[PDB]
Amino acid sequence: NVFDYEDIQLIPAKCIVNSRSECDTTVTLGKHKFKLPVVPANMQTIIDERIATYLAENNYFYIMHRFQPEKRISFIRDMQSRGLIASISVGVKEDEYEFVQQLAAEHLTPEYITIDIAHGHSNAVINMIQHIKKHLPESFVIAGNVGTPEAVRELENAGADATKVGIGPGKVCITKIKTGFGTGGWQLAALRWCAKAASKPIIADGGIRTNGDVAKSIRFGATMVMIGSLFAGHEESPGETINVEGKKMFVEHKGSLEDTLIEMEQDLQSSISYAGGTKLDSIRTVDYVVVKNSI
Amino acid sequence: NVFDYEDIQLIPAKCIVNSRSECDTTVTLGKHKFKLPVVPANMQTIIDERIATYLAENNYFYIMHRFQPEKRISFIRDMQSRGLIASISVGVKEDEYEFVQQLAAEHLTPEYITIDIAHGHSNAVINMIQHIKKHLPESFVIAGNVGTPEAVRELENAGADATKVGIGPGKVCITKIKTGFGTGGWQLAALRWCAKAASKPIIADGGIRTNGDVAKSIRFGATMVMIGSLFAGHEESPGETINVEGKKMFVEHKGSLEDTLIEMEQDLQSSISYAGGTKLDSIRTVDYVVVKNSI
Amino acid sequence: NVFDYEDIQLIPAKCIVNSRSECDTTVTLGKHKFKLPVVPANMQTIIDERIATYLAENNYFYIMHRFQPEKRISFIRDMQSRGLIASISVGVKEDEYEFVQQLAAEHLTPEYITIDIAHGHSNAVINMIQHIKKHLPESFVIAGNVGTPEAVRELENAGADATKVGIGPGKVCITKIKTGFGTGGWQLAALRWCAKAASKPIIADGGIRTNGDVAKSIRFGATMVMIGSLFAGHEESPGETINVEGKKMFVEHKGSLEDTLIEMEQDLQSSISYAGGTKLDSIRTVDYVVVKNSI
Amino acid sequence: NVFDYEDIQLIPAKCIVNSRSECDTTVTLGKHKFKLPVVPANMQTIIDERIATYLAENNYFYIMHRFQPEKRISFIRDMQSRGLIASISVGVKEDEYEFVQQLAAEHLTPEYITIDIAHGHSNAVINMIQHIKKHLPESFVIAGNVGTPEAVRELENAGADATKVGIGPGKVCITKIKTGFGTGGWQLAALRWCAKAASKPIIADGGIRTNGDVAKSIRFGATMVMIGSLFAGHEESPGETINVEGKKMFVEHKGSLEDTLIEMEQDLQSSISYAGGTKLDSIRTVDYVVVKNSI
């Protein structure tokens, strides 16, 4: 009964809008509303401070990476002084306990904290959730990564306000190849399985290959969809651009992040049109089929 | 229980003809009889006025595109004055309401009108059917595109004389990739599903890769099969031809449309031979299997 | 429940021989015994008179093609005068009725006659069987091609001494692509299905890609296996050979037919070894599995 | 119900270690403990005397090949005099009966003897087990190769201390292609099937493509995993190395065997981490899924 993104087709329902433009693609996560149910991967190869500022300035969700952890206290302070959301990443080591205590003492509370660990179903993650909720009670805590309903439950019960689902979701990623474990090759069914157990929002993390996979993630129960590859290789992205005969970034060149986000929004409005609704939640009650040949 | 064209093999029955030439490939749609149960895609990259005249002059069904909508009233008038069928396309916008009223006033009635919309299960399409049937009662109305039995039913009930079935049927088309919705990758099973509900003729639209897929569409309940790629890239087709070392059209060169239609007819006679009959409907009662590896 | 050659693995049983050389690969068809349960395709691109003489001289089964039908009466006479089996092909047209009568009058009786028609489940084939059995009662009659158990039954009941099973068996052959009918992509399961109904020997025709597919055909109930591609492109084969940097025939070059037949025999002895027997029929009672990914 | 390595994903359990370094990857086979549950293929293209000495000196299991059988008595004597395990291969021919008797007479007892035959379910193998156990009772006897639970049972019952499972396990190996028999294309399910019957340790032989397949073999019941390709093409391996623009060995160049074994150990510690344990046996009780598209 297991499948992935490429195996699913959603079934259209009666169209009730006269134009895509009528369809509302917004979503709320905790106390804030955002333009789209998508978020760039919280990695230094995908996001940086300039991209995060663009995103927050235009009401798109972001989560900053923790590659330069010494910069996070200033990052928070600065975003919040421009009236922008501060959304950061933390780990679970002893120095991250101090970091959090530090924040509590300057009375900085980031709107969002993501605990970002490969194998996030652990007491290390559980204790960090409990520590964060003690010292920064107003922070919205996203915990992961997990791959099972028992894990989602345990993390929600520890106090997480959301969980991030995906354990080496790519079909040929390192985790899958080297360990034999994870959601690689069945990420969509894994998401469904985890979502059926969840009382709190889920961020679906990875395995996204097309804009249609965003609608599919919403059907099987995501609130936010975390995306790597589709956001990689924009002019704004980390790295260098390579007439000539067509650019490459570090593998091809996708142009402007802004155009990509607009197209994502348009494609998602089309999805809502086909779902027979006018808003994002309409995607959640469409029927679907599992196709025979998907590759 | 879902599959597509490549997964199906039809099972032969006792041959009762001494020659393919004995097999009748004709079909009727409304008040007219045609040579073959196939029709070119109603798009400007596939059909034009010269091709439509060839087709009507030789008793092949066609449906003209609406890319130059201002030419349709003259097109109708001219075909009908040469004793040829006029088969046109319309949309659902306010100006198409006027267009239809225009026709009613010059007492032009095209034999066939196709309402051609991407997501055709809509009140926009339902109201256009009702408008057409009021002002041009003698016009044979084909409505689409749809992908479900509830849609076929609703459109038939609104007054359509046929429906066109297929929602981004190609395995790697835009609709599938960008929205996650439609019949892409299971077009044959979608056709079967829709056909079981239908009281009126169905035009099966797209996913056709081989001439054998025409017989397969007939088995699972099509009356006409709408074809794009197989008709693309003929000398007569829109675009330009490119010794040398073998032509290309815009991707390869298939030669003469007339030879393609002859071969389609011969291949279809072979299908009837294998079906144990002498006419097209014999294909409808053959057994079939769903193969394991189809790619 | 349908599959093909690539989906099947046969399961080994306790080995009871000390050497492959102990295993007997012979088979009987009618009144004669042959070295191997394989036979080249009866086509002019695969067999000719020199190859047929080699085969008969060494107790391998052959069936000559009918591309030069005027030569068949002399071919029979000449083989039989060298004490060799005469095995020919016939069609079902009125002149083939005369041909047969001709034979009856010179009291030439070929040991084997193959009625070779694409869609062999027909009254044309049934009447030719009955005609042959009237005028040449001692001839062993192989009739085909068929693809169903009802067809095998009808042909056996008409008087055939064997049937040939396969209707466009190749995964990308003409019949499959152009008509949508036949055993293409499920030839092994088709063979099994037909074999369960049969009271007389079956020749399994086509879809053979490896020497292991010969054992597989035997398991699912063949007596002789007709092979095209594996016998194509030998030095002895029709066509022309193309240092240099390695030969081609018309697509690569396989060397000597004799070496190919020796290797086929050795590979088949290995199959019998793995089947836990010492003779060909041991392959018929092994267990098997249907694998998940076969391509 | 049949599958292979590529179809399986193991499901993570709650992580209980603070570091991979906490996880114990050791295994015992008979009277000795080794670093890893892996062993190089006992073939001259993979192992030699220098590699065997490295392995034994560092507490990795090895099994020497028998390509130069005249060297085995000296090999044993020499290893054992350096305080190293002697692990050799034997066949089942009459001269191997003498070889064994020879050993018994110089009172050389190798710690490990592997009876290495393609089709090892045979009385030839059964009698060699019984001969070995009579003349060298202290030798740990591994018998194979087998592919069924009845074979494992018969060999265990004859006196084998372990069995080696795999009959042409590779997807495109000779045995599969030429005979139609064996575990090729379903090696993991074959291992599971055989393991459920076994009272003694199993060595899983072949079909390993990734380090994650080691954990998968452990889940479905291996004690040691025999590996060919992943160990082929190291600087230390048999053959010759080919700036320049990147080395090849005989197909690419993998560098140092020592680095490969370290990485294998690290990857396997990660597997134990994901399995929710601290030792190898934790992998044995994880849940798993069978994915839809695996290629």
From Swiss-Prot, chains A, B, C, D:
Pfam families: IMPDH. NADP(+) binds at residues 202-225. One of its GO terms (molecular function) is GMP reductase activity. InterPro entries: Aldolase_TIM (IPR013785), Dihydroorotate_DH_CS (IPR001295), GMP_reductase (IPR050139), GuaC_type_2 (IPR005994), IMP_DH/GMP_Rdtase_CS (IPR015875), IMP_DH_GMPRt (IPR001093). Its EC number is 1.7.1.7. Keywords: NADP, Oxidoreductase. GO terms for cellular component: cytosol; GMP reductase complex. Disulfide bonds: none annotated. The active site is at C173. It catalyses: IMP + NH4(+) + NADP(+) = GMP + NADPH + 2 H(+). Catalyzes the irreversible NADPH-dependent deamination of GMP to IMP. It functions in the conversion of nucleobase, nucleoside and nucleotide derivatives of G to A nucleotides, and in maintaining the intracellular balance of A and G nucleotides. Belongs to the IMPDH/GMPR family. GuaC type 2 subfamily. This is GMP reductase. The lineage of its organism: Bacteria, Bacillati, Bacillota, Bacilli, Bacillales.
